[PDB]
């Protein structure tokens, strides 16, 4: 039916607008502030009674304030008798678990499940997200989660922006990133190689373009060395492509000092501020991927809508 | 023999005071934030089978402290702690804002959300002090102890206000009526109430004590104190259990006519006392320590919290 | 086009008034007790796929009416109703009668229990009026509408108390301060409040209106009215949303000095108005009917309940 | 070593009887009603860390007693009781008069709702006797103990009816067949069954003592008509033995005008007042059976405490 | 206009018969087992926003079928179906193999477990036929329909047993009393009962056709011994009518050797294979009852619908 | 002093080995299937107030075993067991067969379903070994211990492969990269990776012993093609060490035909039968890891038991 409303957090508003543009809608009116004493203030500026509500709130920026803002907004819509509340969380907070593997066993994803449980008790009915650090986070909920992939937009950018892409190779910065890399190399019909930590390279990278692909970049320590090792192995030029560009701490300083031809991230986190101080950052717009998932969750057009059919 | 106390980053000083009163050292925990702002918690010691009490207040950067508390509770619960208790001296998000919607009331969304998050994190029990509304106790299905600072406030009044026997308990707004009427009856004294500004009750030529549950920006308590000065009150005091003091509060109090502003230690005050000569704190760590004692139930089924002399 | 209203045994006059305001007949239901005291409920019509509103107040034998309500809600939910809303004008069990225990405070056991039973029975939504404490709204996870009689009380004051422009709004105890301060601000009048008995404020030679959310045994409101007479108030009124009037209340009011005791229809008053002449009732069916109209959402997304008179 | 027993207003002679047998005095509780008929409960002593048993029957003013029970259970849980067990000798709402909408069956709601209330109040364990249908045990997620009166009835038969070795056991309706056949097999006697629709008897009753056995007697229309039919078939004398003696409405008048030698019930429901107006009612005491189930629930003496070994 | 019927692997003919009666084709679904015995289910079409009914019986390899049912129910729920109904003609685990115990009764552990798994998988509604005990309805919090085969059995008796007006409806054991008295009352005929303790008969069967009626037949030892006893007591011809024909173990061998004129079952479990080795089996098709219940649950036609009125 | 280890039918060798290591006999339990395929469970001794551990693996007919585990857990829970732990060496349904959609991922319905059933049956704690994905730990709210066979594998390598100091740890696919580099880092040896698309190997294994390491082997098609590829690359001898030996379908025929010097599995699944038809299977006993985890869960020894410190 005709009852969709999009709201934005303070997390990232440019994207919230881009999605609404792609769907032909204006953003719902909402007051999101902080009181003097640090308490999150939310005021929904319009009736959501009977509406299909989508709240866009990345999990970047001051993460706990943004998370609290998201939970209050979701819960407020649910008690104002909204028909459905979907959290559109492009970058899911707390996905990563640096450990100290209790070598006899493994640690559990406390914080990712906590975040999931809070979304559930707040009253979220459905989650739309992008490239969960681990896809199993999908099973931390009982509500449907759509874990969308940036690979098609990356794959695109690669063919259109790297000339010798036909002859290149994709490298993984770490051990765990193999699947992703192998997926992209298989889709492109190119070679793959992987780096592991002193740091070692497995695979042929000599005299061909190397593309480091990973899910996110926070501190950037790892991709930077990886770029050094790829240069030492005789790669012509090195690129870095990450879906989530967190870039905290010394990250910006590291990339400018590193040998990257370009660092490509999607728009799931705001980059406008970071591009001002870093020339090698380029962004892939993923507003259509998200807009298309909201359009399909809404189910207003055809039941047999297939997500996979819409062009990019 | 299985009691463990842990502190968050919110308020270490009380956490130490409580552990002292119980003859315990604080459990080892690394509580920080990563580069990307995510709260990091690591329990540095075993809690398997232990009765764990986490002390965290809701002052400071409240959302970082709250998230840290939830991760600690949950982490303790999946580490097979026998019981996890959240000790939250000042409960965050308890005060509803609203424009007093007419025709109907707003709901305590954020206060219920905090309760819901504490429950799913795995809190088995909450110990707190002077909830903004006592009904917040009923937002949980686990037991909540809503402790009162009143006995310590009562003792402080008798010990520090020479003329306390002939004074008058003033409420800063219409809402705090039951608290001030409660204290005046306990002291066998008069009460008055202020509402925006008008004063109801006689306060001229007697010591006036403003009582409220908490003071944030302090605009209401300072205008009320002004009205009490213009109405001929000898000296005006402000007694609040929770001293948040955000924004211009310190500047407003120093410019205002208070003889003293008394708060408890439920929120850290050392920093604010360096910038305010008139803040005094009532230590309430024993009340909290005695409630923790009582939840643990290590001595007898029949220990009564009220039998312990302050 | 799927609304249905049903009545409990508790108050059927209001249930009819509400149904009238919505152009509806009450749904067919048999509500009795068996020989052995067990509540019998039989939904006499189909509720499959419908937006069901059960109107039941908590008065009379609260426990029989409450159990009856819970069985009706659950039966409708298991009969595959689209939505079941409990319309509870006077919420049972809200007042706390804790002997105080100063160290700390007792918890709303019975009020939380009632909320939990309504939820587990299968209530999707609560409509109620002037909850003893508005925080009871948060004892649920489903939406609760806590409606106010204040607008109807304001209107009644302006139309029936000639001197309302001057006057003064008195609270019977410390707890009702915020409620009386609310009405006085809406009316641009003075307030005072009574405690223990002591009076704080200025009754003078002005009309004093005692305002509180409910009157049970009426010991407090009648002593407050006496104190208001000793302070020289021209005439004393009592205005309460919930007129329970149990025990000696009716007898106490007749002996008291009230010019009138005004209550709303959230609880049935016909029997008690026969034994008390001072009781007048404010009809609130339009507030409840408008919350039901708004819950159903048949008109539009933006129907604002505050725009209707 | 921490067991506390509280009685409700439901039945106190029984709760005292249980307490005598365990060696305990009943815990202090104020259990009354306010002027507005709201139920008032106050726990007169600490239950912190205690294993609490609340005895409340499903008789009397059922909704008052039920609400009272729920408030006490909830109150003990929020006072940090270790465990709260509801001892409900006669489970309210078990029987459901309906009229199976030919083609289907009605569902048990009031018995399931009653179970759900016990659960949401905070009950950890139920002890009950002779549930109208044993499946009510599955209406809970907490353990339910459905004790049987059969052993006390078998004793009573062997010690109070002389010709018991050649007596017939008769079901007053079709639904009670299993219960009566079980007693006939234990006694090594014959049974017969009555069905109304005008009454029909299958089975031989001529010149033998007939014992009508059912789980409950309410209005007693059915057992009285069965008594007439049994005399019509030549039975020497007729007894009726029910577990729950509710006896509402015209029950006492019906039994005083019927041809019963005796009506035997348990004290799951108080009988002193009804016995004053009906010389035929006799009660068999079931306190020990309940006391023994509470002892086992508590688990004081041993892990391998077998409820089936204790003498009666 | 959003209704899909899907079939399990358990009984497809009924799934087809039901889909036919509603004018529908079965939804596309791949239901297999992997090499390693894990149940594989993959939904071949969109169910987003659709009213889904999964028909799976509790016949066959009960645990494999139960897992298949649970995975497709859950799969539909995470694919954002509006509602998912489990149509379970023969409810698994509904019969308790108690030793009854003395003193107390065991609990319906397995039947409640099945109920809890159906609920947690995401079932919104259950349609079933002749639950072994009607109380299983209360093991759920979602609606459950227990539908009866009695009207179809009543039709079959009148249409196929000519001397039906002077027959006897016999229960093979205690407990099946209410079922046989219900049918005897509908036909205005006599009833009798069999009990094992040596088998005993109460009621008259001499010179009249005896119809043994029960809810289900597993190993068939009781019904066959009962058939001998009905013959030795001088019944003209003996029939057996059961709603659920499981016929496991020696059942077929017992029936072929027994004196039954016919054993009549419904189609809730597939019989074609068993009819190939047993000639006395006749089947009553009940697809119209289940389909009509699916129609009424869907609520396509009218709120005032009531399936008591549909012909059969 | 409350430990009871009970065994399922799925693998009792381990159940005995675990109980032996703890100085205990297995609890008495009857675990069978009825004629009609329904799972029968009867607890042969009291568990009231006891700490119960039920050992069942996801091997064999997985759905029958899972149903048996769930019924035992429930039976113990309704018998007022103090705590019930599921010890599930090989977690069923943990592997995803999605054939990933290109824009988003599939949810883990089955695994979570299994998790949800364990939870709703009443499991208080899960002990498992080398979960296919460690995130399954977060599918529960009860604690899950995901134990590693790595230390035991590390022992076996040093003890049985003499040139182990110069060997390579090879991953059969992209997913196991992180698993093999962890082992190579522990041994201070080289790693390599195999990938399909024709099969590629990145890294170097020539003239060195190659050890294929993976979490489980089902049908064994990948590890056997990988072993052939390792032979084409000049590996001295090829080993396979997987935690979980399912070996269904052609696995045994494939392994016997393959060039493996040895295929090493742990005892999480019974191997005696498969070893009779395959001479290259060797088993690592991991019974001490599970027993020590049960010891630590019981908490009978101290608060500091450190799983880390006990030697295997
Ligand atoms: O008065 P009637 O119901 O006809 O017969 C009385 C029965 O009603 C109740 O169900 C009890 O079982 C009584 O035996
Ligand atoms: O079944 P295939 O596709 O032939 O082989 C893939 C793998 O399936 C299991 O992990 C086996 O260990 C195999 O190596």
Residue numbers in the entry:
A (entry chain E): 1 to 197, 207 to 321
B (entry chain D): 2 to 197, 208 to 321
C (entry chain C): 2 to 197, 208 to 320
D (entry chain B), E (entry chain A), F (entry chain F): 2 to 198, 207 to 321
What did the authors write?
Phosphoribosyl pyrophosphate synthetase (PRPS) stands as the first and rate-limiting enzyme in the purine biosynthesis pathway. Conversely, PRPS2 displays ~94% identity with PRPS1 and shares exactly the same biochemical reaction.
To elucidate the function of 3AA, we solved the crystal structure of a PRPS1 chimeric variant, PRPS1( + 3AA) in complex with R5P, ApCpp, and Cd2+ ion by co-crystallization, where 3AA was inserted into the corresponding position of the PRPS1 Loop2. The structure confirmed that the insertion of 3AA led to the flipping of Loop2 and the outward movement of the α12’ helix. These results suggest that the four non-conserved residues of PRPS (3AA and Q156’/K153’) are essential for the conformational regulation of the C-terminal α12’ helix and the subsequent enzymatic catalysis. Conversely, the ectopic expression of PRPS1( + 3AA/K153Q) mirrored PRPS2 phenotypes, displaying stronger growth and migratory abilities than PRPS1.
